[PDB]
Amino acid sequence: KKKIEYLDKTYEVTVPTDKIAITGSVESMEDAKLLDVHPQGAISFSGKFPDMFKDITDKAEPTGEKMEPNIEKILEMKPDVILASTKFPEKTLQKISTAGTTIPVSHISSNWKENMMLLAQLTGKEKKAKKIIADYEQDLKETKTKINDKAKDSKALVIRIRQGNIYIYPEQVYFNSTLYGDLGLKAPNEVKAAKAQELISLEKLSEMNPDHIFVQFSDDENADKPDALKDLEKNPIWKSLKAVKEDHVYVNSVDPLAQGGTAWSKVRFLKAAAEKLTQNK
Ligand SMILES: O=C(N[C@H]1COC(=O)[C@@H](NC(=O)c2cccc(O)c2O)COC(=O)[C@@H](NC(=O)c2cccc(O)c2O)COC1=O)c1cccc(O)c1O
Ligand SMILES: [Fe+3]
């Protein structure tokens, strides 16, 4: 049993352990994917494990849907450690802590290394994590010099459509740490002023008038309004967008269930973003 430090809080956990239950932290599912960690408990999406996670969920029971942990089922698992999420309200984190030692994994994308390092420390995979991290940084380094200086000066936006609504995120959240931080594009004022995931109207978006828009849309997250995207696409206000008219809308260039603040989300978005913002004469 070892004392693990994660974001200035220490936790006492048997290390290494196979008995890890992930609930809420889709970030940790993505870290588990690249570290080849097969958790005892994993997050279900619309009741199943996505094909992209099937290699690591072969020993997993579902811990519940992302935002609806099943405390009873997690209790039944008797896990060594629970990887929860900082997005959970305190009430829910505390309910989860009755099942075992609970570490809320950060949804702040600037903590991607720390999140990976935590899972590595739990599984004794520190070397493997170091390599994944260093390969992203080399990848970023080579991709950057390829990125064209016109696109760098441009106004680009990442939006995610949930329950029919359009959301934006802070500068250090979701894919934005890669778009504005790593790639160096200028965050729009609306992103800079955002304090968390926040609703933006199509009407307001028409005023922002970005040069490029990455739209993330998961059918699982839009059960009420499954036409949310096709509805937007037929809307005269959407059709007035510079990005739309210039064919600079990129729908799901990364899987819509990707969370942004993880090694795996970063490498994917880096590649997709570089694709859309490169050229040749
Ligand atoms: O800033 C983010 N949230 C804010 C703001 O998000 C919201 O207010 C709402 N939210 C969605 O409707 C949402 C609809 C469909 C899908 C959603 O994910 C929704 O969030 C409600 O969620 C919640 O109230 C709470 N939330 C979870 O419990 C959760 C638990 C586990 C896992 C979660 O994702 C959770 O939200 C807390 O939400 C927040 O603090 C935020 C950022 C980056 C990425 C996020 O996902 C964020 O939510
Ligand atoms: Fe959320």
Residue with tokens 């991709």: 143
CA 91 to chain centre: 23
Kindly report the length of the chain.
281
- Residues whose beta carbon lies within 6 Å of some atom of ligand 1: 24, 66-67, 85, 87-89, 107, 162-163, 169, 173-174, 196-197, 221
What class is the 1-124 domain? Answer: alpha beta
* Residue whose C-alpha is closest to residue 157's, from 179, 133, 131, 183: 179
For ligand 1, pick from 27, 45, 67 the residue to mutate: most ligand atoms within 8 Å of CB: 67
Q: Looking at the CA of 89, name the nearest ligand.
A: 1
Neighbours of 51 (CB within 10 A): 8
Same fold yes or no, 1-124 and 125-281:
yes
Rounded Cα–Cα distance for residues 126 and 27 (Å): 17
Residue with tokens 């004022």: 189
Q: Where are the alpha helices (DSSP H) in the chain?
A: 26-35, 71-77, 90-96, 112-123, 126-146, 149-152, 176, 189-193, 202-208, 228-233, 236-239, 242-245, 263-276
* Residue whose C-alpha is closest to residue 30's, from 101, 102, 127, 136: 136
* Residue nearest (by alpha carbon) to ligand 1 atom 11: 162
Spatial CB neighbours of 223, under 8 Å, sequence gap ≥ 6:
none
Structure tokens at 264: 């795996």
Bridge-partner residues for 37, per DSSP?
none
How do the domains of the chain map onto residue ranges?
Answer: 1-124, 125-281
Rounded Cα–Cα distance for residues 215 and 167 (Å): 10
The third-level CATH classification (topology) of the domain covering 125-281 is Rossmann fold (3.40.50)
